[model samples]
Target chain A: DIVLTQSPDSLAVSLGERATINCKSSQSVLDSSNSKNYLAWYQQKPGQPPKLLIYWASTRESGVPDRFSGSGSGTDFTLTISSLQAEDVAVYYCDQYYSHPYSFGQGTKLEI
Target chain B: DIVLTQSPDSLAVSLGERATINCKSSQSVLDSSNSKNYLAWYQQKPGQPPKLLIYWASTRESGVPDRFSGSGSGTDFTLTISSLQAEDVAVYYCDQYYSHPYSFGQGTKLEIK
Candidate 1:
């Protein structure tokens, strides 16, 4: 099973400021055939289910604000919020779908 | 984007009793090429990330207890716990990876009665 470790567990950023979260996987999730990383990012607000934010490493999901972006490949990845909004205060998670028993990061809590 | 709607926002089942959660998608998640449903189920304990329970509609993830089962296909699916365990109390969710912009259900919360 691939494990995803997220950094800082929790983060504090003022509104309009930038916030960054990192996720490191135990093994490479990059698919050689398509040259795309089989990774995704999600956001979960209190009392709600997680919402897909980014997929294939950096492609933003439709309707996701432009301020949110994902980058990195291989076994490392980052989810960056260029300008954090009040509504963005939530837990962020990283998921790898490259192999069986798909695993998720412990999650990073974002706060204002 | 596919929308998944879960029934009964919350449920209470007695210990050792059966618990079932239902999920309905906006459209068929069956892929003609592979003949497989693109749905998956997850369990999110309090203050924790969601854990994958079942995928491909009916295939339980390795290590998941046999008591936990998934069934149905296309746009409708179900997650059933034959016998509820204390540790099973959590919010259950259904997600579809059949298409781009994957989406998740509203979620079903299960608790001991």
Candidate 2:
């Protein structure tokens, strides 16, 4: 199984401040077919199902705020919130979907 | 992006009893060439990361219990617990991997009865 490690299990940032989370995969998620990484980011609020924030490394999901962006490639990736909003308080996770038995990072908690 | 609808918001079952959850997708997830679906299931517990339970529609992840099984095709799927166990109490979600912006069901909360 490919291990996904996320940094700073918990984070506290003032509203309007940038909130950054990091994710590292044990193996490369870059699919040779399309030459695109299979990494994705998700946001999960308390008691609600996760919502896709970004996929294919940098493409933002529909309806996702422009303030939320993803960057990085190969094995290291980052999810950045340009200006954190109150609605952004939740747990963020990085997942690899290139292969079966897809794995997720331990998650980073975003707190005010 | 396809929508995934899961049945029964919650389920309560006694240990050793069977419990099943359903997931219905708005579109087909079948890969014509491989005849395989890109559906997967995950389990999440309170204050913890979600764990991959089953993927490729039915293949179980390493070390997952035999009691946990998945079935279905195309737009509909099911996750079954042959005999519910105490450790099985958690939220189960079904997701589609065939398309970008992979969508997940609302999730079914499983608890001990």
Candidate 3:
């Protein structure tokens, strides 16, 4: 119900290179019965509202590139960008919508 | 995909006054098959991340003050601050989680004048 720790406060990646951001939650977001992780990923560019990139742990939203992929379960997760682009420079966050007071990671800043 | 639009790009209200933010979705977020509106509200302050305040149309998240209330259904919704405080000055965003690839409003910035 609390705490989503994000690693690498900032990461610098050259164009076409891969980038990875890790997120760890304090408690189990995976439902025992459904075995589904109620997690989501978001990307926020400067001066813009955050956009949903992935949900339910790894499902990509429509129109989102396959280069942006989410993986992991339980308390651990990873968001990987297969080929980072100039437009991919932004902050990334993991959100836990499993229960009340849905929380988010501190955010990992992705830079070019 | 649902589109969310928030009114008043910014607002300045006196302390102890009332404030409100409007959010309208291009399509109904309520699922007739599910009978639920997949809407949520968040508050974001400068230099900090956004916090979930309300969800499921009108259910306020744990620890959220009663003063902060959400109303409306389907395509239109509202987040109202019954009594504004200095601490309430921040950007408010409305998000539709009922649909995949959730969408958010442009955000309404609030301040105490």
Candidate 2 vs candidate 3: which has greater DockQ?
Answer: 3
- Candidate ranking under lDDT, highest first, comes to 1, 2, 3
Best by DockQ: 1
After superposition, candidate 1 runs with Cα above 4 Å error? none
lDDT of 3 by residue, A4-44 (tens): 99998899999999999999999989998988999999999
lDDT of 1 by residue, B2-58 (tens): 899999899999999999999999999999998999999999998788999999999
* Interface RMSD in angstroms for candidate 3: 1.1
Q: Give one digit per residue, the lDDT tens place, for model 2 in B1-113.
A: 78899988898999899999999999999899999999989999987778889888999988788999999999999999988889999999998978866788999999999
- Listed per candidate, the RMSD to the true structure in angstroms reads 1.1, 2.0, 1.2
Model 2, residue A23: distance off in Å is 1.3
How far is B78's C-alpha from truth in model 2 (Å)?
A: 0.9
- Higher-TM-score candidate of 2 and 3: 3
Model 1 alpha-carbon miss at residue A37, Å? 1.2
On lDDT, the stronger of 1 and 3 is 1
Q: For each candidate, report its DockQ versus the true two-chain complex.
A: 0.84, 0.63, 0.80
| Residue A110 shift from truth in candidate 3, angstroms | 0.8
lDDT by candidate, in order shown: 0.94, 0.92, 0.91
